[PDB]
């Protein structure tokens, strides 16, 4: 006829034997059938929705399905630990994770257990994992700088603080490095006394080898930068429900900084592995497969995660928390449900081409499929002026090379000469972050066509020599770009003159 959870013979036997089990089922439960990393518990009638429960196995779970007579907890933990008819006690609180200031230079897991084991986490509070996005009214436009040290990603992609900006590209191109370079570049920003010049960068590692992350941590401490950055970890080892809760928890920690008004940044690497995790969880919850077998609430998950990163209003102290979610594109095909969903949410994407990567640019920023919907201003005015038209130029090189494969018009050839020469200038090797002051003249040179004086072979020589030359000839110009942050007509002329001077030699 029908199957009801009370039909379970031991439960059924208590009801027959008089009735119930003395109101023990309002705040403690006893586990019923269990497996598939979800448990069905009898009682816990005072359970709050999305409460954290602690099982006597030590495993803690988030109530997901509140059903008449039974609750379907999701086990943040391994199955072997949990056993049937175990007594579940209510934590009594909605899932919260400790948040505070003393997570800078800490590796924690998703439960906030310090897996760096640099003692207990110094956390002011705990804050609920899910928190609503700031509305239209608490939002405020971005204008703060985020300089990545990668000229392309800092002259074709303007990034500022409190934004939502996608970083997308191909599997195991050491995808991480672009972000690592940003963290390094804003070392001197983060050596800045002003804490609106300090970023607190959170690296959420989802679905990555526990070994690889440990190498990264050591790398970060070699590059002396761990102390201004947080690492949240949800490794490959870590259980799929933990992985599901990992980005949300990380964003709570960031929000404590954000809600100090202080400027932060968070990199969620890789949400594609969250998609697989949510898929696993959903399928094991027997929720009907969505497209590409990825659940239908995957859009909801990502959108809730992403939209909690913001540049708050003046009232809220201009609470920056930049978001850079790192998507591992399926075969480099941006048509694909998970990538497209992210693209629509984010403002700007930074697609990278394998062909260019292979063709010796590490990093190799495809600019056909990199856009930044951050638009004009979010980076230094000097780097708006000099950067002027370069997006056009490299999409004129793109156009030129579209039809390059018959006869060439002098206009196309001139562009090809600029394009190729510009491409050499673009090239940057990993762990070479470039100062803002340094980026202005290089871009000036190419834009003002003074880079035709250099041949492709000698572009690299020109770059290093030019920077050394500028400093030796007059570091005054660069100091002006350092403080003024703008090129006065005199400074601009002086720079034109200076560029011409070096170009000549």
């Amino acid at each position: 006829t029908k199957a009801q959870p009370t039909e379970v013979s031991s439960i059924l036997e208590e009801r027959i034997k008089g009735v119930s089990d003395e109101a023990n089922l309002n705040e403690t439960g006893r586990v019923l059938a269990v497996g598939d990393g979800i448990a069905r518990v009898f009682g816990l009638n005072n359970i709050q929705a999305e409460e954290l429960v602690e099982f006597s196995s030590g495993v803690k779970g988030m109530a997901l399905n509140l059903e008449p007579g039974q609750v379907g907890i999701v086990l943040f933990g391994s199955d072997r630990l949990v056993k049937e008819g175990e007594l579940v006690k209510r934590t009594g609180n909605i899932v919260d994770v400790p948040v505070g200031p003393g997570l800078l230079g800490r590796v924690v897991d998703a439960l906030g257990n310090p897996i760096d084991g640099k003692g207990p986490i110094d956390a002011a509070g705990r804050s609920r994992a899910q928190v609503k996005a700031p509305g239209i009214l608490p939002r405020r436009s971005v204008h703060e700088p985020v300089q990545t040290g990668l000229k392309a990603v800092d002259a074709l992609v303007p990034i500022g603080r409190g934004q939502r900006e996608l970083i997308i590209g191909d599997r195991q191109t050491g995808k991480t490095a672009v972000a690592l370079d940003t963290i390094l570049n804003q070392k001197r920003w983060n050596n800045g006394s002003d804490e609106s010049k300090k970023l607190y960068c959170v690296y959420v590692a989802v679905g990555q080898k526990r070994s690889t992350v440990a190498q990264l941590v050591q790398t970060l401490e070699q590059h002396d930068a761990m102390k201004y950055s947080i690492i949240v970890a949800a490794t490959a080892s870590e259980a799929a429900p933990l992985q599901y809760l990992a980005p949300f928890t990380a964003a709570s920690i960031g929000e404590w900084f954000r809600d100090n008004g202080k400027h932060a940044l968070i990199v969620y690497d890789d949400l594609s592995k969250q998609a697989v995790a949510y898929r696993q969880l959903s399928l094991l919850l027997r929720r009907p497969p969505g497209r590409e077998a990825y659940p239908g609430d995957v859009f909801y998950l990502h959108s809730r995660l992403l939209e909690r990163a913001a540049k708050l209003s003046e009232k809220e102290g201009s609470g920056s928390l930049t978001a850079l979610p790192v998507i591992e594109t399926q075969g480099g095909d941006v048509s694909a449900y998970i990538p497209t969903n992210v693209i629509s949410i984010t403002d700007g994407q930074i697609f990278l081409e394998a062909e260019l990567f292979y063709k010796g640019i590490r990093p190799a920023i495809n600019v056909g499929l990199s856009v930044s919907r951050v638009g004009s201003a979010a980076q230094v005015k000097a780097l708006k002026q000099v950067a002027g038209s370069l997006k056009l130029f490299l999409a004129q090189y793109r156009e030129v090379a579209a039809f390059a494969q018959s006869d060439l018009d002098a206009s196309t050839k001139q562009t090809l000469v600029r394009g190729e020469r510009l491409t050499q200038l673009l090239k940057q090797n990993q762990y070479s972050p470039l100062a803002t002051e340094e980026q202005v003249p290089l871009i000036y040179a190419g834009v003002n066509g003074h880079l035709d004086g250099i041949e492709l072979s000698r572009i690299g020589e020109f770059e290093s020599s030019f920077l050394s030359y500028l400093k030796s000839n007059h570091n005054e110009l660069l100091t002006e770009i350092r403080e003024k942050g703008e090129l006065s007509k005199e400074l601009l002329a002086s720079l034109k003159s200076a560029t011409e001077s070096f170009v000549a030699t």
């Binding site: 009370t6 013979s9 059924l12 009801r15 027959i16 008089g18």
Partner: protein
């Protein structure tokens, strides 16, 4: 768990009832009260057969229970809690089903075989007795298990006789012999 496992679906209620009242050792009492309420089911045929139909509310269902226990107070007490369960679970179609299941389960706990000697004719009482004697004589009855034996008339059994009890049958039929004949005299 208490003797004789029944894998009844909605018979899980009967199983539960059995073990629950076995552990309270009020099984004979249960069986008797169950007979009495079962009797009052048969003796309530209008709206006690014709309102075993699912259309009752929670509140209206409860009031059907209340009318039944007004009719008699001979109830196990555990089966009054079971009555509550059946009202709440709105188990009413498999209500006499549960009664039958508990009865079988109970009288199995007491020990009592069942049996039938389906035949193509209604055999003699002399036959019933002679066969019953024979069956008790055969090691099939080992005692602690009694017997019911009903010879039934079924035209379907063509040839022989068929004895059935304890999931052990001797099935004499004409059909199997006919079958062998047919097959070989066509091949």
């Amino acid at each position: 768990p208490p003797p004789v496992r029944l894998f009844g679906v909605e018979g899980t209620y009967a199983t539960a009832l059995y073990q629950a009242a076995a552990k309270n050792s009020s099984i004979d009492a249960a069986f008797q009260s169950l007979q009495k309420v079962e009797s009052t089911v048969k003796k309530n045929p209008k709206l006690g057969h014709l309102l075993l139909n699912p259309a009752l509310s929670l509140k209206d269902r409860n009031s059907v229970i209340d009318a039944i226990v007004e009719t008699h107070k001979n109830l196990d007490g555990y089966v009054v809690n079971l009555l509550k369960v059946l009202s709440e679970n709105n188990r009413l179609g498999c209500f006499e089903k549960i009664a039958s299941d508990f009865g079988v389960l109970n009288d199995a706990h007491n020990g009592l075989l069942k049996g039938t000697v389906t035949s193509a004719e209604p055999l003699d009482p002399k036959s019933f007795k002679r066969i019953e004697k024979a069956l008790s004589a055969s090691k099939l009855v080992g005692q602690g298990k009694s017997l019911k034996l009903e010879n039934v008339v079924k035209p379907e059994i063509k040839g022989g006789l068929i004895v059935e009890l304890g999931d052990k049958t001797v099935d004499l039929s004409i059909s199997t012999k006919i079958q062998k004949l047919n097959k070989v005299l066509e091949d």
